[PDB]
Amino acid sequence: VARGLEGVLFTESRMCYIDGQQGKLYYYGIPIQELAEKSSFEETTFLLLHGRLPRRQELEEFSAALARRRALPAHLLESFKRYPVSAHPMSFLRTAVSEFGMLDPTEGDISREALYEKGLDLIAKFATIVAANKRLKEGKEPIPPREDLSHAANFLYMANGVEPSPEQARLMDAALILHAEHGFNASTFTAIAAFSTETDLYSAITAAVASLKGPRHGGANEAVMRMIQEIGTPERAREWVREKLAKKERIMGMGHRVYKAFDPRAGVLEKLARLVAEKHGHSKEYQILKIVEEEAGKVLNPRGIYPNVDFYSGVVYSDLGFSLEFFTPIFAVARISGWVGHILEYQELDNRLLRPGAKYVGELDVPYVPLEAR
Amino acid sequence: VARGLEGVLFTESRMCYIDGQQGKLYYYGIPIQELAEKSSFEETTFLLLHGRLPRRQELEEFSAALARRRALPAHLLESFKRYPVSAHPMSFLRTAVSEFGMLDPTEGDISREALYEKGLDLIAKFATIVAANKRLKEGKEPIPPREDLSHAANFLYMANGVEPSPEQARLMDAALILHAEHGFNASTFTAIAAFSTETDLYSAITAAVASLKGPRHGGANEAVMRMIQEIGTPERAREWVREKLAKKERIMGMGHRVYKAFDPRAGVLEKLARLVAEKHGHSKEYQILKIVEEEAGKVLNPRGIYPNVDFYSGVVYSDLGFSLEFFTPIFAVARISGWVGHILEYQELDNRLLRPGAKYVGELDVPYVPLEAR
């Protein structure tokens, strides 16, 4: 019995190479650090769906294609008015994707080309859905997308009601690129497991959202923000760290389960976060984070325990206007590209129905006892 | 690489024993034939959730508990008014479960007891959701549940607007018992894969519905009904069969991928279907089916190729008032009990995050080529 399917390889892939021991992460062979620094969510999405970087003309048309698809149908925006505002944002997203599928006249078409086109629609619309949820949570109206803005800049615009600075847009753009893909994690696997019966794309993506909503996957930066809230103020941060280390207690965001050395995604984000802080000001959360980074680093750096991407992303989203409950939704806004890419790849290279089993340890030949005899 | 996870055992279970070669199917050790003939959907559901048959008092209270939970909240019934009536019934169900979760004040509670209680709520409500969809497809209003009727009888009542005869109720009751559980098939596995991140029950069940919607799982009787429609009339059935056999072409519903001999679920259903036909009349579909059964049987029976449960269930549902597009939804109305039982069991016996992987066959050290150089 292969508990948790640990060590089990069930298919082949060309999408994501992960070497946790050496700190390497590639998207179709290209290092994530290069993409986060030089690419855009649109270009990286093209890479994840096509397997190669786009030529200039291809990128322009691709970005425009996504931009035109950002707006949600009026039918869905109307439904959002009654979606419980008190509900978990991931449940809002889960329902939105499912209901949206009902509006597709050819919802069940799963030809490669149909999956690709419906996929572009979902990639463009995810940011709009999440931003709408945020606006409604604030008692405000969702904001129509601005096609002149990039996917990342428009996401911030629709979420906050104001166009972000170039620095803020670049920070969010990098964050999305950094979380767009990560191999066969739980949500990507669930998407494939669902798609293996040849169900429609909305069904597979709804299953992915359902998986991602779980605390065991896609919620790492929540623990870091909870730590920051526990610290409360910058003035107590340094002392808090000392006490934690003295008690041999773990510091959230330090070290990683997969990346034994450096998390290849952390560096670019830390730098861009600094640039935003220097232009827009250092938030209370940012100040606390930097003190923890420095004080904890004095002891952890020599031990090879470095801050990972989750150590920075939560503060980044907070600084960009988002609350903790929207962290996983933002993760989904990025990961939808990886999910679509994985569905296209699985269909192309494997496409088999998944048929795992379980070792039977139950009983046999148990009698159907008459009701009165029990 | 274990393609399709074929032959891979990832956990242990006591719920369902399947011996396809010998035609055996047990629910917690009890033969399915016994349950289909002597049990009720309520009692079999108790068995699937508790691991044992209920005592008289337990069964009475359990059945009453489910009955009280059949009614859907007004908020959801209101939302149903705008759900696209043209949409796939499984997409309607997928969305209903997801939206319903948003109404649960403690949606994310996954303690064993919470999963059980929320599970009872979904088991009771699934029939109501599907019946509502059917009514709306007919331009009619959903019908409030009648707590005095059994789960199966009430399902027919809410779907057709009239209380079924004892024969019809017993037929549907048996059909539900027969499809309530079947080990680690695709939808049950997807439910577990999603739940492995400790996401909420609605998320896991929505993922299960997404999986079940696919044509590769839970749609076997559709092919049989399509065959019947192709035949058109009873007068052409016998000749149609001869031509098919002469061309060495397969007869839908004959033989089974798993059950090499008898499908242990077929016998009880065939008998109850006959009793309904004898009291309410033989439909065109039933007449065609019986002619196919007899004519094809002359050649297939000696070869050990017998009609399976899917050969009868489609006609059964049609005779009970349902269209082909509602066959899988009915399957879900029954399977929800197995899904909930599986989530409870997985949590109790394993509860591990699933972490399968893929063999990397992609490229490494691919350069991030400047835009103009592509």
Q: Kindly report the number of other CB atoms within 10 A of residue A3's CB atom.
A: 15
Q: Kindly report the number of other CB atoms within 10 A of residue A365's CB atom.
A: 10
Beta-carbon separation of A3 and B13 below 8 A: no
Active site residue B280: no
Q: How far is B339 from chain A (nearest CA, A)?
A: 15
What values do phi and psi take at B244, rounded to 5? -65, -45
**Token pair 């002149």: residue:** A148
> Strands, E, within chain A: which ranges?
9-13, 16-19, 24-27, 30-31, 357-360
The domain limits of chain B are: 11-218+321-354, 219-320
Instruction: Show the tokens assigned to A111.
Output: 């030809």
Contact B113, A117 (CB under 8 A): no
Residue A254 forms beta bridges with which residues? Answer: A307
> Span A219-320: which CATH code?
1.10.230.10
Q: How many Å apart are CA A367 and CA B15, to the nearest integer?
A: 15
Active site residue A350: no
Beta-carbon separation of A358 and B1 below 8 A: no
**Which residues in chain B are contacts of A110 at CB distance < 8 A?**
none
- Nearest alpha carbon to residue B152 among B140, B138, B166, B132: B166
Among the options B256, B263, B319, B342, which is catalytic?
B256
Q: How many Å apart are CA B311 and CA B316, to the nearest integer?
A: 9
- Nearest alpha carbon to residue B47 among A358, A360, A359, A362: A362
Q: How many Å apart are CA B276 and CA B16, to the nearest integer?
A: 29
Whether chain A has a CB inside 8 Å of the CB on B258: the answer is no
Of all residues in chain B, the one with the smallest CA distance to A199 is B214
- Nearest alpha carbon to residue B283 among B229, B222, B242: B229
**Which residues in chain A are contacts of B103 at CB distance < 8 A?**
84, 87
DSSP of A99-139, one letter per residue? HHHHT-TTTT--SHHHHHHHHHHHHHHHHHHHHHHHHHHTT
- Amino acid letter for position B273: A
Size of interface A-B (CB pairs under 8 A): 364
- Amino acid letter for position A86: S
What values do phi and psi take at A8, rounded to 5? -85, 130
Nearest-CB residue to A8 (from B26, B202, B357): B357
Q: Kindly report the number of other CB atoms within 10 A of residue B374's CB atom.
A: 13
Q: How many Å apart are CA A15 and CA A72, to the nearest integer?
A: 29
- CA A334 centroid distance within chain: 5
Beta-carbon separation of A211 and B207 below 8 A: yes
Sheet of A24-27, strands arranged across = A16-19, A24-27, A30-31
Torsion of CA A142, A146, A149, A151, to 10 degrees: 50
Q: How many Å apart are CA B328 and CA B319, to the nearest integer?
A: 16
C-alpha pair distances (Å), B140 with each of B137, B155, B161, B164, B170: 7, 16, 10, 19, 26
Q: Kindly report the number of other CB atoms within 10 A of residue A326's CB atom.
A: 21
Contact A137, A85 (CB under 8 A): yes
What values do phi and psi take at A24, rounded to 5? -115, 140
Contact B112, B348 (CB under 8 A): yes
Q: Kindly report the number of other CB atoms within 10 A of residue A350's CB atom.
A: 18
**CB-count exposure of residue B200 (10 Å: 0-12, 13-18, 19+):** buried
Overall size of chain A counted in residues = 374
Residue B299 DSSP SS3: helix
The reported resolution of this PDB entry, expressed in Å, is: 1.5
Q: How many Å apart are CA A28 and CA A39, to the nearest integer?
A: 14
- Nearest alpha carbon to residue B299 among B248, B337, B257: B248
Contact A152, A173 (CB under 8 A): yes
β-strand A24-27 against A30-31: which pairing, if any? antiparallel
In CATH terms, the superfamily for domain A11-218+321-354 is Citrate Synthase, domain 1 (1.10.580.10)
Sheet of B16-19, strands arranged across = B16-19, B24-27, B30-31
Whether chain B has a CB inside 8 Å of the CB on A257: the answer is no
Among the options B173, B263, B310, B319, which is catalytic?
B310
What values do phi and psi take at B17, rounded to 5? -105, 125
- Nearest alpha carbon to residue B336 among B55, B49, B54: B49
Among the options A151, A310, A319, A342, which is catalytic?
A310
Q: How many Å apart are CA A340 and CA B149, to the nearest integer?
A: 45
Whether chain A has a CB inside 8 Å of the CB on B4: the answer is yes
C-alpha pair distances (Å), A302 with each of A277, A299, A305, A372: 27, 6, 8, 71
Q: How many Å apart are CA B125 and CA B333, to the nearest integer?
A: 9
Q: Kindly report the number of other CB atoms within 10 A of residue A274's CB atom.
A: 16
DSSP of A226-278, one letter per residue? HHHHHH-SHHHHHHHHHHHHHTTPPPTTBS-SS-SS--TTHHHHHHHHHHHHH
Contact A348, A225 (CB under 8 A): no
Instruction: Tell me if B11-218+321-354 shares its fold with B219-320.
Output: no
